[PDB]
Amino acid sequence: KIEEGKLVIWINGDKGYNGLAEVGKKFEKDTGIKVTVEHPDKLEEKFPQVAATGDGPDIIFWAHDRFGGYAQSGLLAEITPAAAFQDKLYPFTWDAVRYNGKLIAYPIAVEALSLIYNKDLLPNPPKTWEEIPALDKELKAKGKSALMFNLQEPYFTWPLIAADGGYAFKYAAGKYDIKDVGVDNAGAKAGLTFLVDLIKNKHMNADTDYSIAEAAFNKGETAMTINGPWAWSNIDTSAVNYGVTVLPTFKGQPSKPFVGVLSAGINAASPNKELAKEFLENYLLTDEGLEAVNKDKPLGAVALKSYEEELAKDPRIAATMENAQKGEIMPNIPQMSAFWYAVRTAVINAASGRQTVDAALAAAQTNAARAAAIAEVQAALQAALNSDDDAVVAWVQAVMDLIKNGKVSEEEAKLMLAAAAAYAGVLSPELMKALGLTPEQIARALARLRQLLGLEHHHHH
């Protein structure tokens, strides 16, 4: 299915695919091994579909956050770079490509938000968030504002919320602990409280979204914004004299933006794994290889220390890496979906005054953790869905039916799914304790689930 003796590479069309093709031509000239670079749309969804049956590319390039899911499905070869090669990339970028105590991809490039400022309004940007109210006062007297950034998406507000102690999921003992969410601790509450106070004191508008903030900064109306390297081109077009710098501190702690790592994984079914390793380690992840890609389309900051030191002569790239080194590697697990939605709701609810900061973040903590736990026991039940016992299959089917008909509240779902998993013989004491449940609870829940299934299946309304 995958052709032996050559390399097929998938990378998104917004990257330097022609330059990667030039690295492949050099590989071919040296070895005889041909390299094909393709940029299909939705490669991040096509890959799991084709790799599941042993087809697809030898190498896939994508944001690191998807690779945990791919590794869970058995779609990636585990990589074994030697110590000397590992030392050539920034050590925190390897923290982006771990799964189950192993490495599952090569880090290529690094992106994170920075502080962007208008040097003609603000030649000396603030070192602290706490300085921004006073700055805004003085700029408001000139018909300007100090800071406008996207408040609608929690990716943009996270650096402040995480500064004094918020975190998404805690890493522990070789995996992310999906029980340990850091959304409602005192640090997260302090950062969101500062954001909400900026809104209450009229230095920001709760309504500000991406396009409003971008337009305001590029028209010279606000002295600062928070954005990533994807945005610089538009500012270039606007001829604002801008600088890019380290984000301000909060309570004396660095802002902690999420870090995304462009990564290269190897298909678990590739007959060319050693060739892929030689290509990535000895051709792509060199000064010459990254320069070829970068000359086609800029990569931004890169994971390779030697070439990042050259790119960092651009002070914007230097600032991107400085903020990345102060940031939080985005967890590479599918549970982040629930996190994103939960925190989004919390910030909007607190910023609009529908909830206190304390209640909004309590809700987001509960919702993110509960969704992760429900997904764990749901995976166990999926193992029961594809078993060879038709009584078991019929039963777990019935329970799924019962929930999709809305006969079970979100807050009862964990106990009910655990009772289903216990009757089906797929609930283990490790999972039971990790759900925070006890056998007595599960048995009472099981009687109740018997009743609910009875009314749902053998009852005339």
CSV table of N, CA and C in Angstrom, one decimal, residues 309-413:
chain,number,residue,atom,x,y,z
A,309,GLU,N,19.0,30.4,16.3
A,309,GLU,CA,19.9,31.5,16.6
A,309,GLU,C,20.1,32.5,15.5
A,310,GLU,N,20.1,32.0,14.2
A,310,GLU,CA,20.1,32.9,13.1
A,310,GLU,C,18.8,33.6,12.9
A,311,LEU,N,17.7,32.9,13.0
A,311,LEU,CA,16.4,33.5,12.8
A,311,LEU,C,16.1,34.6,13.8
A,312,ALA,N,16.6,34.4,15.0
A,312,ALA,CA,16.4,35.4,16.1
A,312,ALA,C,17.1,36.7,15.9
A,313,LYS,N,17.9,36.9,14.9
A,313,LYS,CA,18.3,38.2,14.5
A,313,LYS,C,17.1,39.1,14.2
A,314,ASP,N,16.0,38.5,13.7
A,314,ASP,CA,14.7,39.2,13.6
A,314,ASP,C,14.1,39.3,15.0
A,315,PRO,N,14.1,40.5,15.6
A,315,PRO,CA,13.6,40.5,17.0
A,315,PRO,C,12.2,40.1,17.2
A,316,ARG,N,11.4,40.0,16.2
A,316,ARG,CA,10.0,39.5,16.4
A,316,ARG,C,10.1,38.0,16.6
A,317,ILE,N,11.0,37.3,15.9
A,317,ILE,CA,11.1,35.8,16.1
A,317,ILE,C,11.8,35.6,17.5
A,318,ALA,N,12.7,36.4,17.8
A,318,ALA,CA,13.3,36.3,19.2
A,318,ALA,C,12.2,36.4,20.3
A,319,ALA,N,11.3,37.4,20.1
A,319,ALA,CA,10.3,37.5,21.1
A,319,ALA,C,9.3,36.3,21.1
A,320,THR,N,9.0,35.8,19.9
A,320,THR,CA,8.2,34.6,19.8
A,320,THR,C,8.8,33.5,20.6
A,321,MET,N,10.1,33.2,20.5
A,321,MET,CA,10.7,32.1,21.2
A,321,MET,C,10.8,32.4,22.7
A,322,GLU,N,11.0,33.7,23.1
A,322,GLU,CA,11.1,34.0,24.5
A,322,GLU,C,9.8,33.8,25.2
A,323,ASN,N,8.7,34.2,24.5
A,323,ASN,CA,7.3,33.9,25.1
A,323,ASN,C,7.0,32.4,25.1
A,324,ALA,N,7.5,31.7,24.0
A,324,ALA,CA,7.3,30.2,24.0
A,324,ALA,C,8.0,29.5,25.2
A,325,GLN,N,9.2,30.0,25.4
A,325,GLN,CA,9.9,29.4,26.6
A,325,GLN,C,9.3,29.7,27.9
A,326,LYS,N,8.5,30.7,28.0
A,326,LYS,CA,7.8,31.0,29.2
A,326,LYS,C,6.4,30.5,29.2
A,327,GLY,N,5.9,29.8,28.2
A,327,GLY,CA,4.6,29.3,28.0
A,327,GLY,C,4.3,27.9,28.5
A,328,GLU,N,3.1,27.5,28.2
A,328,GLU,CA,2.6,26.2,28.5
A,328,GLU,C,2.4,25.4,27.3
A,329,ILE,N,3.2,24.3,27.1
A,329,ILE,CA,3.0,23.4,26.0
A,329,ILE,C,1.5,22.9,26.0
A,330,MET,N,0.9,23.1,24.8
A,330,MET,CA,-0.5,22.7,24.8
A,330,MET,C,-0.6,21.1,24.9
A,331,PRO,N,-1.4,20.6,25.9
A,331,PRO,CA,-1.5,19.2,26.0
A,331,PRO,C,-1.9,18.5,24.7
A,332,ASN,N,-1.4,17.4,24.4
A,332,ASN,CA,-1.5,16.8,23.1
A,332,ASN,C,-2.6,15.7,23.1
A,333,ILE,N,-3.7,15.9,23.8
A,333,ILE,CA,-4.7,14.9,24.1
A,333,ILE,C,-6.0,15.3,23.5
A,334,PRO,N,-6.9,14.4,23.2
A,334,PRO,CA,-8.3,14.8,22.7
A,334,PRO,C,-9.1,15.5,23.7
A,335,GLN,N,-8.9,15.3,25.0
A,335,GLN,CA,-9.6,15.9,26.1
A,335,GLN,C,-9.5,17.4,26.0
A,336,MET,N,-8.5,18.0,25.3
A,336,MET,CA,-8.4,19.5,25.2
A,336,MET,C,-9.7,20.1,24.6
A,337,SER,N,-10.4,19.3,23.7
A,337,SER,CA,-11.6,19.9,23.1
A,337,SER,C,-12.5,20.4,24.2
A,338,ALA,N,-12.8,19.5,25.2
A,338,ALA,CA,-13.7,19.9,26.3
A,338,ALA,C,-13.2,21.1,27.0
A,339,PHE,N,-11.9,21.1,27.3
A,339,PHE,CA,-11.3,22.2,28.0
A,339,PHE,C,-11.6,23.5,27.2
A,340,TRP,N,-11.3,23.5,25.9
A,340,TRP,CA,-11.4,24.8,25.1
A,340,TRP,C,-12.9,25.3,25.3
A,341,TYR,N,-13.8,24.4,25.2
A,341,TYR,CA,-15.2,24.9,25.2
A,341,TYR,C,-15.6,25.4,26.6
A,342,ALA,N,-15.1,24.7,27.6
A,342,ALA,CA,-15.4,25.1,29.0
A,342,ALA,C,-14.9,26.4,29.4
A,343,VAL,N,-13.6,26.6,29.1
A,343,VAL,CA,-13.0,27.9,29.5
A,343,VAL,C,-13.5,29.0,28.6
A,344,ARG,N,-13.9,28.7,27.4
A,344,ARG,CA,-14.5,29.8,26.5
A,344,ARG,C,-15.7,30.3,27.2
A,345,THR,N,-16.6,29.4,27.7
A,345,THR,CA,-17.8,29.8,28.3
A,345,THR,C,-17.5,30.6,29.6
A,346,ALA,N,-16.5,30.1,30.4
A,346,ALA,CA,-16.3,30.8,31.6
A,346,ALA,C,-15.8,32.2,31.4
A,347,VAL,N,-14.9,32.4,30.4
A,347,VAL,CA,-14.4,33.8,30.3
A,347,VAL,C,-15.5,34.7,29.8
A,348,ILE,N,-16.3,34.2,28.9
A,348,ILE,CA,-17.4,35.1,28.3
A,348,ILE,C,-18.4,35.4,29.4
A,349,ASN,N,-18.7,34.4,30.3
A,349,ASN,CA,-19.7,34.6,31.3
A,349,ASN,C,-19.2,35.6,32.4
A,350,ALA,N,-17.9,35.5,32.7
A,350,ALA,CA,-17.3,36.4,33.7
A,350,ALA,C,-17.2,37.8,33.1
A,351,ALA,N,-16.8,37.9,31.8
A,351,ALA,CA,-16.6,39.2,31.2
A,351,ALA,C,-17.9,40.0,31.0
A,352,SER,N,-18.9,39.2,30.8
A,352,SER,CA,-20.3,39.8,30.5
A,352,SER,C,-21.0,40.1,31.8
A,353,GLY,N,-20.5,39.6,33.0
A,353,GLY,CA,-21.2,39.8,34.2
A,353,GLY,C,-22.4,38.9,34.5
A,354,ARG,N,-22.5,37.8,33.7
A,354,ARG,CA,-23.5,36.8,34.0
A,354,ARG,C,-23.2,35.9,35.1
A,355,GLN,N,-21.9,35.8,35.4
A,355,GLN,CA,-21.4,34.9,36.5
A,355,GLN,C,-20.3,35.6,37.2
A,356,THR,N,-20.1,35.4,38.5
A,356,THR,CA,-18.8,35.8,39.1
A,356,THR,C,-17.6,35.0,38.5
A,357,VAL,N,-16.4,35.6,38.7
A,357,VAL,CA,-15.2,34.9,38.3
A,357,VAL,C,-15.2,33.5,39.0
A,358,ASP,N,-15.5,33.5,40.3
A,358,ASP,CA,-15.4,32.2,41.1
A,358,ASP,C,-16.4,31.1,40.5
A,359,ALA,N,-17.6,31.5,40.2
A,359,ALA,CA,-18.6,30.6,39.7
A,359,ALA,C,-18.3,30.2,38.3
A,360,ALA,N,-17.9,31.1,37.4
A,360,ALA,CA,-17.6,30.8,36.0
A,360,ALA,C,-16.4,29.8,36.0
A,361,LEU,N,-15.4,30.0,36.7
A,361,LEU,CA,-14.2,29.1,36.7
A,361,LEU,C,-14.5,27.8,37.4
A,362,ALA,N,-15.3,27.8,38.5
A,362,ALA,CA,-15.8,26.5,39.0
A,362,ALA,C,-16.5,25.7,38.0
A,363,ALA,N,-17.4,26.3,37.3
A,363,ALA,CA,-18.2,25.6,36.2
A,363,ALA,C,-17.2,25.0,35.2
A,364,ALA,N,-16.2,25.8,34.7
A,364,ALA,CA,-15.4,25.4,33.7
A,364,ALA,C,-14.5,24.2,34.1
A,365,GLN,N,-14.0,24.3,35.4
A,365,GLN,CA,-13.2,23.2,36.0
A,365,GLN,C,-14.0,21.9,35.9
A,366,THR,N,-15.3,22.0,36.5
A,366,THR,CA,-16.1,20.8,36.6
A,366,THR,C,-16.4,20.2,35.2
A,367,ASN,N,-16.8,21.1,34.2
A,367,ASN,CA,-17.2,20.7,32.9
A,367,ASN,C,-16.0,20.0,32.2
A,368,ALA,N,-14.8,20.6,32.3
A,368,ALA,CA,-13.7,20.0,31.6
A,368,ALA,C,-13.3,18.7,32.1
A,369,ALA,N,-13.2,18.6,33.5
A,369,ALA,CA,-12.9,17.3,34.1
A,369,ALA,C,-14.0,16.3,33.9
A,370,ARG,N,-15.2,16.7,34.0
A,370,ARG,CA,-16.3,15.7,33.9
A,370,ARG,C,-16.4,15.1,32.4
A,371,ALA,N,-16.2,16.0,31.4
A,371,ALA,CA,-16.1,15.5,30.1
A,371,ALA,C,-15.0,14.5,29.8
A,372,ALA,N,-13.8,14.8,30.4
A,372,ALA,CA,-12.7,13.8,30.3
A,372,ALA,C,-13.1,12.5,30.9
A,373,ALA,N,-13.6,12.5,32.1
A,373,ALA,CA,-13.9,11.3,32.8
A,373,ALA,C,-15.0,10.5,32.0
A,374,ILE,N,-16.1,11.2,31.6
A,374,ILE,CA,-17.1,10.6,30.8
A,374,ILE,C,-16.5,9.9,29.6
A,375,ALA,N,-15.5,10.6,29.0
A,375,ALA,CA,-14.9,10.0,27.8
A,375,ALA,C,-14.1,8.7,28.1
A,376,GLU,N,-13.5,8.7,29.3
A,376,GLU,CA,-12.8,7.5,29.7
A,376,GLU,C,-13.7,6.3,29.8
A,377,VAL,N,-14.8,6.4,30.6
A,377,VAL,CA,-15.7,5.3,30.8
A,377,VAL,C,-16.4,5.0,29.4
A,378,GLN,N,-16.6,6.0,28.6
A,378,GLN,CA,-17.2,5.8,27.3
A,378,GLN,C,-16.3,5.0,26.4
A,379,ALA,N,-15.0,5.2,26.5
A,379,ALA,CA,-14.1,4.3,25.7
A,379,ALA,C,-14.1,2.9,26.2
A,380,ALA,N,-14.2,2.7,27.5
A,380,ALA,CA,-14.4,1.3,28.0
A,380,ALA,C,-15.7,0.7,27.4
A,381,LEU,N,-16.8,1.5,27.4
A,381,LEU,CA,-18.0,1.0,26.8
A,381,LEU,C,-17.9,0.8,25.3
A,382,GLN,N,-17.0,1.5,24.6
A,382,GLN,CA,-16.7,1.3,23.2
A,382,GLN,C,-16.0,-0.1,23.0
A,383,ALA,N,-15.1,-0.4,23.9
A,383,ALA,CA,-14.5,-1.7,23.9
A,383,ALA,C,-15.6,-2.8,24.0
A,384,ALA,N,-16.6,-2.5,24.8
A,384,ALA,CA,-17.8,-3.4,24.9
A,384,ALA,C,-18.7,-3.4,23.7
A,385,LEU,N,-18.6,-2.3,22.9
A,385,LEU,CA,-19.5,-2.2,21.7
A,385,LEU,C,-19.0,-3.2,20.6
A,386,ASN,N,-17.8,-3.5,20.6
A,386,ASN,CA,-17.2,-4.3,19.5
A,386,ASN,C,-16.8,-5.7,20.0
A,387,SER,N,-17.4,-6.2,21.0
A,387,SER,CA,-17.1,-7.5,21.6
A,387,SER,C,-18.0,-8.5,20.9
A,388,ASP,N,-17.6,-9.8,21.1
A,388,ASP,CA,-18.3,-10.9,20.5
A,388,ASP,C,-19.5,-11.5,21.3
A,389,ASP,N,-19.9,-10.8,22.3
A,389,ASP,CA,-21.1,-11.2,23.1
A,389,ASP,C,-22.2,-10.3,22.7
A,390,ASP,N,-23.3,-10.8,22.2
A,390,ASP,CA,-24.4,-10.0,21.7
A,390,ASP,C,-25.3,-9.5,22.8
A,391,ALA,N,-25.4,-10.2,23.9
A,391,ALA,CA,-26.1,-9.6,25.1
A,391,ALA,C,-25.4,-8.3,25.5
A,392,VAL,N,-24.1,-8.4,25.7
A,392,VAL,CA,-23.3,-7.2,26.1
A,392,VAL,C,-23.5,-6.1,25.1
A,393,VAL,N,-23.4,-6.4,23.8
A,393,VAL,CA,-23.5,-5.3,22.7
A,393,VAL,C,-24.9,-4.7,22.8
A,394,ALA,N,-26.0,-5.6,22.8
A,394,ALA,CA,-27.3,-5.1,22.9
A,394,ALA,C,-27.5,-4.1,24.1
A,395,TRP,N,-26.9,-4.5,25.3
A,395,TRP,CA,-27.1,-3.7,26.5
A,395,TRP,C,-26.4,-2.4,26.3
A,396,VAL,N,-25.1,-2.3,26.0
A,396,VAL,CA,-24.4,-1.1,25.9
A,396,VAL,C,-25.0,-0.2,24.8
A,397,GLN,N,-25.5,-0.8,23.7
A,397,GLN,CA,-26.3,0.0,22.8
A,397,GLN,C,-27.5,0.6,23.4
A,398,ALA,N,-28.3,-0.2,24.2
A,398,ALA,CA,-29.4,0.3,24.9
A,398,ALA,C,-29.1,1.6,25.7
A,399,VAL,N,-28.0,1.5,26.5
A,399,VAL,CA,-27.6,2.6,27.3
A,399,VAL,C,-27.3,3.9,26.5
A,400,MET,N,-26.5,3.7,25.4
A,400,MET,CA,-26.3,4.8,24.5
A,400,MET,C,-27.6,5.4,24.0
A,401,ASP,N,-28.5,4.6,23.5
A,401,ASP,CA,-29.9,5.1,23.2
A,401,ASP,C,-30.5,5.9,24.3
A,402,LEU,N,-30.4,5.4,25.5
A,402,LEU,CA,-31.0,6.1,26.7
A,402,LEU,C,-30.4,7.4,26.9
A,403,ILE,N,-29.1,7.6,26.7
A,403,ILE,CA,-28.6,9.0,26.9
A,403,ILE,C,-28.9,9.9,25.8
A,404,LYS,N,-28.7,9.4,24.5
A,404,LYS,CA,-29.0,10.3,23.4
A,404,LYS,C,-30.5,10.8,23.3
A,405,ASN,N,-31.4,10.0,23.9
A,405,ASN,CA,-32.7,10.5,24.1
A,405,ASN,C,-32.9,11.4,25.3
A,406,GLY,N,-31.8,11.8,25.9
A,406,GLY,CA,-31.9,12.8,27.0
A,406,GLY,C,-32.6,12.3,28.2
A,407,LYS,N,-32.5,11.0,28.6
A,407,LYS,CA,-33.1,10.5,29.8
A,407,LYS,C,-32.1,10.5,31.0
A,408,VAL,N,-30.9,11.0,30.8
A,408,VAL,CA,-29.8,11.0,31.8
A,408,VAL,C,-29.2,12.4,31.8
A,409,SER,N,-29.1,13.0,33.0
A,409,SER,CA,-28.5,14.3,33.1
A,409,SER,C,-27.0,14.1,33.0
A,410,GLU,N,-26.3,15.2,32.5
A,410,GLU,CA,-24.9,15.3,32.5
A,410,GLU,C,-24.2,14.9,33.8
A,411,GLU,N,-24.8,15.2,34.9
A,411,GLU,CA,-24.2,15.0,36.2
A,411,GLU,C,-24.4,13.6,36.7
A,412,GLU,N,-25.3,12.8,36.1
A,412,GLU,CA,-25.5,11.4,36.4
A,412,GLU,C,-24.8,10.5,35.4
A,413,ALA,N,-24.2,11.1,34.3
A,413,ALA,CA,-23.7,10.3,33.2
A,413,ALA,C,-22.6,9.4,33.6
